[PDB]
Design a binder for this molecule. Structure first.
Ligand code: ATP
Ligand code: ATP
Ligand code: ADP
Ligand code: MG
Ligand code: MG
Lengths: 539, 478, 523
């Protein structure tokens, strides 16, 4: 019928069974624990023993405790009521609003959608970031990748992409938090209640998003399957409902790391540099479930933390085959102070072809690639020469190229809480010819930084007008200034007579609810009969 | 055989007193399997599919046969999985025959020296780093750089060549997709249908979504499909794409099966499992069938390291390298074929003699250009025996640019590179580029292309017309 | 040879019993002739099979859990990290020399608990609750769960409180928060202890001003620091008075591994109490790489599989829940805070080091301290172009926040033109002036070790280089001109800006006049 935990090694525990062993990728439950604990079996030991992975911390499992079989894979409650809910890996409410108002639980482990039901019709997903929509154009229902180091600006692109595409769609979306910080988790909960994507009250059914959160605090059972828990509710809305759902998964690398933290612990030799031996079927099984079929559409948005901007590690080097549109973030362009710091060379999508979009889109983005590759091949030699002997034919594809690295920049709506400048929702054909102009020489007349953090071709000519005036401004130093006391300025002590009286009490309020109990001077132990005794005094 | 321990797509079975090494077994729940290693007490069995169906104590039946794939002409146009089943949704594969995927390569006396050339449409491949019918050439590169593009534009060129070439010497395509997405192959099944190449192509696509040994077996079965076109005497093109993922396949099973790890945790014999693949495609001699087989493996590097362990093997067993760098790809030379890094072993020994007297200088003039390539970012001029060569190199960049999915016929790219090195070049400025590239290939009469494909070489009864035809380059857009 | 053959072996098929009648008669005199050589059968207790070096392997113990404190028979405390099939691997707190093959192991049943509360303010324990400061046991304290998971998503709010460090190199250049996880990653001997101790002495001399609801108490966790350095910092905390509002858990390098492994964990167990009861808490996890080496010692004796640099698999999860339990709660649980300082020493410049890539991805902002910048006069040697934060505005002083954009972006161009000094250009009055500006900005932003200067003096001190008042002053003597800018101005204007908090035009008129009233000694 049921079995017992026989062995605990950190975050993997071993359950023995007396006949009819559970199928692989089923769910187990322990009774008498603090929280409900789900064990997901990964391999059979051989001696009537499954080997598990732990959805929460194992600190507390006694050897021999009762383990029941649910006989079935992990079931999350899918449904239309799940919108506006912050969801766990194992189906829990962690936003503390009752149970999940949904039915028809579904197995979150399945096979990939087959080869026959594959979509090849491609639609350009216009986002609103001038480096995305020109250079690496995303695909509707396709894949969106995001690499970059820890501190280059990956996650602030993701919520910016939510404000771009997940608001102006009307349908449903899903934010799949896989092992990121709670800070960028909790802040996104506030900036979707205020932006109205997630609602509270009796309007829970008209919302647009579910949040599946497997953040960094959980042990790697939960950080390894929150990718699948966020995935299957997106694949539930695809096949049953037909709506296009946007999957915003964060830190796909943390999905592959959470596998790799216990993959050695299940009895496997480490692979290349120390990552997991089975990363191919782990990630390849993850990715090809995220597609768009004949029945519906899933537009995957993937953020990946890469360690120290090195793309030779095999845990992101399997991901490059698995992403059509890739927005590779360079720390160098952020060290230039340019946001978004999207690489003009490393970030290249699959929509970029004149056989689909049109020659007017493909030629300027290729024209961007000529002027920016040669700018990289010349900024090595500009430090030996200083750009003074080039005979005025290589001083044209440089001066525009120093401008075009600023013309990838844009103030963000989600970032204006800490940058001050208001964000732009930029369209496509207005800036393609705008990108085309500064490549051609129509805007050679302008200075350097007028291109920085702007939008259309109207705002670049109007940053120079303000900039040109500001070189005519601050041309005075004499008198009639703020520094005199004649106009409105009080004396220095009459500021001080409006200060509010701040009380200091020196005892700080620390003995009001703290139950200042006593602790034992001698360590308390148990006896063989189990009752509490002090230590029997003998070595 | 009963299963003791099963996990991660690896089932360790007990029993099976007569199972063979590499024998294809079958489980209870319809999923097949192969036993790779056979130990004293338990036998290790790798699993071709999902592994969450087998409990402990299930049963395995031996089929008594080493793993085989259905080979033959009925596979043409179908999209199969690597084990030998179709996934296209077009029902079964009829007019086929099953044959063993594991045999030995052709020996010494089976071989004949590769002399006649394969033509692959990309002029940067055909003229600079050429490829013979029955030859091994590695499309190495970065990712997002066009290794699939050099593969598929060769395939579309064969369909652009097979319609005007007789029945025997028609080059059939088996592009084997290893580790690509299940949605990328959907684009590739579209491009072979829309162009019409699906009369000639067999798309073996073991994805990233299936289990480990399917990605391991997809090159052997795909080369076993290439075995059928060899001993029938036809000519065949076999392409493995992203063979590094097949190395990720042979890594993933070896460490799961507790075989001893070697360099970068790959097994030691992974060089042998790459060689018996790539030594299977060759040119059989005129006593044993006369057919050929040319293999185009693909290795995806990381940042251009050609000394990584997996690339170290394939460069050693194959002949040359078509190095496709990502950085110079945005420098407009399409494909980014680093001629100083990309060599083929045969050189001019196996090239069509309409190119031989002009590729025999083209690797010499590009040698003069790459030795002087640091000067193009300098305005201060040298003696103009350098700077004319810098423009002889510059109009030999855009001389080699190839539009995507558009292979050009073989005798057209012969006279086009004849129109740059001989000196009928675009001396006027690069404001007008669009009528300086296409003018040679469109404004001459099409009698001259008919002659060059018949005789094999620019005879001296043609150069006076050919110098005259390039002289009246029209360019009506000036 | 299967288990059904084993269950068939449970059915007796002996067909004769011509031994069992007699071997049952000579069994009991045999076991009672050799009775002295029998240790008793032990079920809910434990007894040691193998012991060594901090990992002791104990037979039995059917009652224990993972993470239960056990007590050996000599009084030594222990911890059950993994539980194998027949035995339980027990990690040993302290020296392990007293344990033999055959000694008793007593289960205490509880999860490991170190005493928490405000009575510990002024005490230095180790990671186990035992006092080393020579002031006896802890009074008015209580035990708490050190293995507790972090506060959830519904429990947190957006951070607002800036957490002034008292350092102009920090508060102007890297915005810190009160619930922000700030990493100090550098080389060895480069000022990492300098930046952390500058924050606490500032937070003590700004603790006797703020009214009960921004009072940031500090716990400084010493992992592997030698015991003279522990007496050094106790001497530093006492001789300014900071020890009144300072707890310090101090795991030396001459202690065992798991006392160093638990000391940041017990270090945050104190500071969760300051977060739970509404106050603000400072925590510094000093030498957090050396705590991870203290993790690597235990596992590699524990027959556990190694990975990158022979560190185990789950070492990301170690530093994750060590730095996720520091937070800023919502209004519904007091509104308390915790702000985090982990210290990671690079292996002389490996940012791709295995511990580094974990802790740079967990934490919110990082502060690079190269050994390059430490000898160019820049002390503390903060890297500006490589240091990022998250929350930006509403994480600095708000009057500083407007002038910080004038400070950061001019520093952004200056780091690009500083390496272009190989030609002697100084062209068009801009390639010299941004060199003239940013060099004085570097000579602005140096300070002294152990000199906590409040932000209100720094919002004036940041104004001296952003405006004029320094456009005629050399690159040699700004470090003795800044103090005369501090001294000769009216000492009442600093209080009213910290009272205001923002640069109003009502106060902007005074701040332009008073910096020409001062006369600079750089000449
Ligand atoms: N001649 C060309 N002109 C413009 N773009 C091209 C050309 N050739 C290839 N590309 C670009 O290459 C991209 C993908 O081609 P391909 O799949 O061959 O590259 P790849 O190196 O195989 O990439 P991956 O290895 O990631 O699959 C497309 O986005 C396409 O825009
Ligand atoms: N801001 C500073 N100004 C002047 N000297 C400093 C400064 N910071 C550090 N030092 C010098 O550096 C030495 C070490 O200081 P500190 O312990 O802060 O560095 P650390 O990198 O934390 O050292 P460790 O790596 O050993 O912990 C001190 O002896 C002091 O002389
Ligand atoms: N467009 C932008 N505007 C303002 N700040 C930006 C922009 N892009 C990136 N940043 C900065 O980059 C920093 C890192 O952001 P985040 O996405 O959290 O990085 P990571 O994904 O590496 O953790 C943020 O603090 C943010 O302020
Ligand atoms: Mg490819
Ligand atoms: Mg120190």
């Amino acid at each position: 019928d049921a079995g017992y935990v026989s062995q605990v090694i950190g975050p993997v525990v071993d359950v023995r069974f007396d006949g009819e062993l559970p199928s692989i990728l089923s769910s187990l439950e322990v009774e008498g624990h603090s929280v409900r604990l789900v064990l997901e079996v990964a391999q059979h030991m051989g001696d009537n023993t499954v080997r598990c992975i732990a959805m929460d911390s194992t600190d507390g499992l006694v050897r021999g405790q009762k383990v029941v079989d649910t006989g079935s894979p992990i079931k999350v409650p899918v449904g239309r009521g799940t919108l506006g809910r912050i969801m766990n890996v194992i189906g829990e409410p962690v936003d503390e609003q009752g149970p999940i108002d949904a039915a028809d639980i579904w197995s979150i482990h399945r096979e990939a959608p087959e080869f026959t039901e594959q979509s090849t019709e491609q639609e350009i997903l216009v986002t609103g970031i001038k480096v995305v929509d020109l250079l690496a154009p995303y695909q509707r229902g396709g894949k969106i990748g995001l690499f970059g180091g820890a501190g280059v600006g990956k996650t602030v692109l993701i919520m910016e992409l939510i404000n771009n595409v997940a608001k102006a769609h009307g349908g449903f979306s899903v934010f799949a938090g896989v092992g990121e910080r709670t800070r960028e988790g909790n802040d996104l909960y506030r900036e979707m209640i205020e932006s109205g994507v997630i609602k509270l009250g009796a309007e829970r059914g008209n919302s647009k998003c579910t949040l599946v959160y497997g953040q960094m605090n959980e042990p790697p059972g939960a950080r390894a399957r929150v990718a699948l828990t966020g995935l299957t509710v997106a694949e539930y809305f695809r096949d049953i409902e037909g709506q296009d759902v946007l999957l915003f998964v964060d830190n796909i690398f943390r999905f592959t790391q959470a596998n790799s933290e216990v993959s050695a612990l299940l009895g496997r030799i480490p692979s290349a540099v120390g990552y997991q031996p089975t990363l191919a079927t782990d990630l390849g099984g993850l990715q090809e479930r995220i597609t768009t079929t004949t029945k519906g559409s899933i537009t995957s948005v993937q953020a990946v933390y890469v360690p120290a901007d090195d793309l030779t590690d095999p845990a992101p080097a399997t991901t490059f085959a698995h992403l059509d549109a890739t927005t590779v973030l360079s720390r160098s362009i952020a060290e230039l102070g340019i946001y978004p710091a999207v690489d003009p060379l490393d970030s290249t999508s699959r929509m970029l072809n004149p056989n689909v979009i049109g020659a007017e889109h493909y030629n300027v983005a290729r024209g961007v690639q000529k002027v920016l590759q040669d700018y990289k091949n010349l900024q090595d030699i500009i430090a030996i020469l200083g750009m003074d002997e080039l005979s005025e034919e290589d001083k044209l594809t440089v001066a525009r190229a120093r401008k075009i690295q600023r013309f990838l920049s844009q103030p963000f709506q989600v970032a204006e809480v800490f940058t001050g400048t208001p964000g732009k929702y930029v369209d496509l054909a207005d800036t393609i010819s705008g990108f085309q102009g500064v490549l051609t020489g129509k805007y050679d007349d302008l200075p350097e930084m007028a291109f920085y953090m702007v939008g259309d071709i109207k705002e670049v000519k109007e940053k120079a007008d303000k900039m040109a005036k500001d070189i005519a401004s601050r041309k005075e130093a004499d008198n009639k200034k703020v520094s005199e006391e004649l106009k409105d300025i009080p004396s220095l002590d009459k500021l001080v007579s409006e200060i509010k009286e701040v009380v200091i009490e020196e005892d700080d309020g620390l003995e009001e609810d703290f139950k200042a109990e006593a602790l034992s001077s001698e360590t308390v132990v148990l006896n063989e009969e189990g009752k509490s005794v002090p230590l029997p005094k003998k070595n | 055989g009963r299963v003791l321990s099963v996990g991660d797509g690896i089932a360790r079975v007990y029993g099976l007193k007569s199972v063979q090494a590499g024998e294809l077994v079958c489980f209870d729940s319809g999923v097949k399997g192969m036993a790779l290693n056979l130990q004293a007490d338990h036998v290790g069995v790798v699993v071709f599919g999902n592994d969450s169906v087998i409990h402990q104590g299930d049963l395995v039946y031996r089929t008594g046969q080493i793993v085989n794939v259905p080979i033959g002409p009925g596979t043409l146009g179908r999209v199969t999985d690597g084990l030998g089943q179709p996934i296209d949704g077009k029902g079964p594969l009829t007019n086929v025959r099953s044959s063993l995927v594991e045999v030995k390569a052709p020996g010494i006396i089976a071989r004949q020296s590769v002399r006649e050339p394969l033509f692959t449409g990309v002029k940067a491949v055909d003229a600079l780093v050429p490829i013979g019918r029955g030859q091994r050439e590695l499309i190495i590169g970065d990712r997002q750089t066009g290794k699939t593009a050099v593969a598929i534009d060769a395939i579309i060129h064969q369909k652009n060549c097979n319609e005007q070439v007789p029945k025997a010497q028609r080059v059939y395509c088996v592009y084997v997709a290893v580790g690509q997405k299940r949605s990328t192959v959907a684009q590739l099944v579209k491009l072979f249908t829309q162009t019409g190449a699906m009369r000639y192509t067999i798309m073996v696509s073991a994805t990233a979504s299936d289990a480990a040994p399917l990605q391991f077996l997809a090159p052997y079965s795909g080369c076993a499909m290439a075995e059928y076109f060899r001993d029938t005497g036809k000519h065949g093109l076999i392409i493995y794409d992203d063979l590094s993922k097949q190395s990720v396949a042979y890594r993933q099973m070896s460490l799961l099966l507790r075989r001893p790890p070697g360099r970068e945790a790959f097994p030691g014999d992974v060089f042998y499992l790459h060689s018996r693949l790539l030594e299977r495609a060759a040119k059989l001699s005129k006593e044993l069938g006369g057919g050929s087989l040319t293999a185009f493996p693909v290795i995806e590097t990381q940042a251009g390291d050609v000394s990584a362990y997996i690339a170290t093997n394939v460069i050693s067993i194959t002949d040359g390298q078509i190095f496709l760098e990502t950085e110079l790809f945005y420098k407009g030379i399409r494909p980014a074929l680093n001629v100083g890094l990309s060599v083929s072993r045969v050189g001019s020994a196996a090239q069509f003699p309409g190119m031989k007297q002009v590729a025999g200088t083209l690797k010499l003039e590009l040698a003069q250009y790459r030795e002087v390539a640091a000067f193009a970012q300098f305005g201060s001029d040298l003696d103009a025996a350098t700077q004319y060569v810098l423009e002889r190199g510059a109009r030999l960049t855009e001389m080699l640019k190839q539009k995507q999915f558009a292979p050009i016929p073989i005798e057209r790219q012969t006279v086009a590179v004849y129109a740059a090195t001989k000196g009928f070049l675009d001396k006027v400025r690069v404001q007008d580029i669009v009528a300086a590239e296409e003018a040679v290939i469109s404004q001459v009469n099409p009698a001259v292309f008919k002659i060059l494909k018949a005789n094999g070489k620019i005879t001296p009864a043609l150069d006076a017309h050919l110098k005259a035809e390039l002289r009246k380059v029209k360019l009506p857009g000036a």
